[PDB]
Structures are given as C-alpha cells and as structure tokens.
C-alpha cells in the first residue's frame, strides 16, 4: 500500500462520451471512450433511422457505436 504522496488514480466520474453506445473507461491513466457491446437478449424490436431493425434499443446503440453514427428510433410500419 505504499504510494506516491499527492497522487491518485484517474476516474471517469466527471467525463461523458457523446457517442451513442459508448462509455468512459480509464486507459493508461486517461479517460477514453469505448463501445459497451453488452446487451440483454430481451426482445423489443426497434426500427431505426437507418431504415434497419434492431433486436432492442441496446443492440441499436451498439451498432451506432460500432459505426460512429447516431441512430434514432422510428415507428415500424407494415
């Protein structure tokens, strides 16, 4: 438990990542944004602004993050 006095690890509390589906992580002592990529297999089919359909909103967000884009929900019509 010996540490340099007047030092602390970095934390994500006061940072936000604007990219849909992303979250802050600490890498090499600095905040960075990374895609979460973890969702429940709980169906809630979601049509999106790209014209495609997602298993739920979490999967929509994960695709948005993977592509570096923004996807919004639209009504499915049939």
Short mmCIF file of C-alpha atoms in Angstrom, two decimals:
data_model
loop_
_atom_site.label_atom_id
_atom_site.label_comp_id
_atom_site.label_asym_id
_atom_site.label_seq_id
_atom_site.Cartn_x
_atom_site.Cartn_y
_atom_site.Cartn_z
CA UNK A 1 0.00 0.00 0.00
CA UNK A 2 2.99 2.30 -0.45
CA UNK A 3 2.07 5.02 -2.96
CA UNK A 4 3.42 8.41 -4.05
CA UNK A 5 2.01 11.07 -1.75
CA UNK A 6 -0.28 13.52 -3.50
CA UNK A 7 -1.27 11.14 -6.30
CA UNK A 8 -4.43 9.29 -7.22
CA UNK A 9 -5.73 7.08 -9.98
CA UNK A 10 -7.80 8.72 -12.70
CA UNK A 11 -11.57 8.15 -12.82
CA UNK A 12 -14.45 8.61 -15.28
CA UNK A 13 -16.96 10.26 -12.89
CA UNK A 14 -16.77 13.76 -14.40
CA UNK A 15 -16.47 12.68 -18.05
CA UNK A 16 -19.12 11.76 -20.60
CA UNK A 17 -18.85 10.17 -24.03
CA UNK A 18 -21.16 11.77 -26.59
CA UNK A 19 -21.16 8.78 -28.95
CA UNK A 20 -24.31 6.70 -28.71
CA UNK A 21 -23.49 3.29 -27.22
CA UNK A 22 -20.14 4.38 -25.76
CA UNK A 23 -18.91 4.83 -22.22
CA UNK A 24 -15.87 6.26 -20.49
CA UNK A 25 -13.02 3.95 -19.45
CA UNK A 26 -9.59 4.68 -17.94
CA UNK A 27 -6.67 3.51 -20.08
CA UNK A 28 -3.06 4.33 -19.18
CA UNK A 29 -4.34 6.81 -16.62
CA UNK A 30 -6.52 8.81 -19.04
CA UNK A 31 -10.25 8.83 -19.84
CA UNK A 32 -11.17 7.35 -23.23
CA UNK A 33 -14.45 6.40 -24.91
CA UNK A 34 -15.20 2.77 -25.79
CA UNK A 35 -18.23 0.87 -27.06
CA UNK A 36 -20.10 -1.10 -24.38
CA UNK A 37 -21.09 -4.05 -26.62
CA UNK A 38 -23.12 -5.91 -23.98
CA UNK A 39 -26.90 -6.23 -24.15
CA UNK A 40 -29.69 -8.38 -22.75
CA UNK A 41 -31.30 -10.84 -25.15
CA UNK A 42 -34.68 -9.37 -24.25
CA UNK A 43 -36.64 -8.63 -27.44
CA UNK A 44 -38.11 -5.20 -28.07
CA UNK A 45 -37.87 -4.86 -31.83
CA UNK A 46 -36.77 -1.35 -32.78
CA UNK A 47 -36.96 0.25 -36.21
CA UNK A 48 -34.25 2.88 -36.62
CA UNK A 49 -33.45 5.97 -38.68
CA UNK A 50 -31.04 3.98 -40.88
CA UNK A 51 -34.00 2.00 -42.22
CA UNK A 52 -32.91 -1.13 -40.33
CA UNK A 53 -34.39 -3.03 -37.38
CA UNK A 54 -32.66 -4.00 -34.13
CA UNK A 55 -33.39 -6.69 -31.55
CA UNK A 56 -33.73 -3.96 -28.89
CA UNK A 57 -32.50 -0.42 -28.25
CA UNK A 58 -29.26 -1.65 -26.69
CA UNK A 59 -28.39 -3.51 -29.90
CA UNK A 60 -29.28 -0.38 -31.88
CA UNK A 61 -26.91 1.65 -29.69
CA UNK A 62 -24.16 -0.94 -30.14
CA UNK A 63 -24.43 -0.71 -33.93
CA UNK A 64 -24.39 3.10 -33.74
CA UNK A 65 -21.20 2.97 -31.66
CA UNK A 66 -19.57 0.44 -33.99
CA UNK A 67 -20.23 2.72 -36.98
CA UNK A 68 -19.58 6.02 -35.20
CA UNK A 69 -23.06 7.29 -36.13
CA UNK A 70 -26.31 8.30 -34.44
CA UNK A 71 -29.41 6.11 -34.78
CA UNK A 72 -32.84 7.22 -33.59
CA UNK A 73 -36.00 5.18 -33.09
CA UNK A 74 -38.77 5.29 -35.69
CA UNK A 75 -42.16 3.59 -35.76
CA UNK A 76 -42.21 0.24 -37.52
CA UNK A 77 -44.89 0.21 -40.21
CA UNK A 78 -46.24 -2.77 -42.16
#
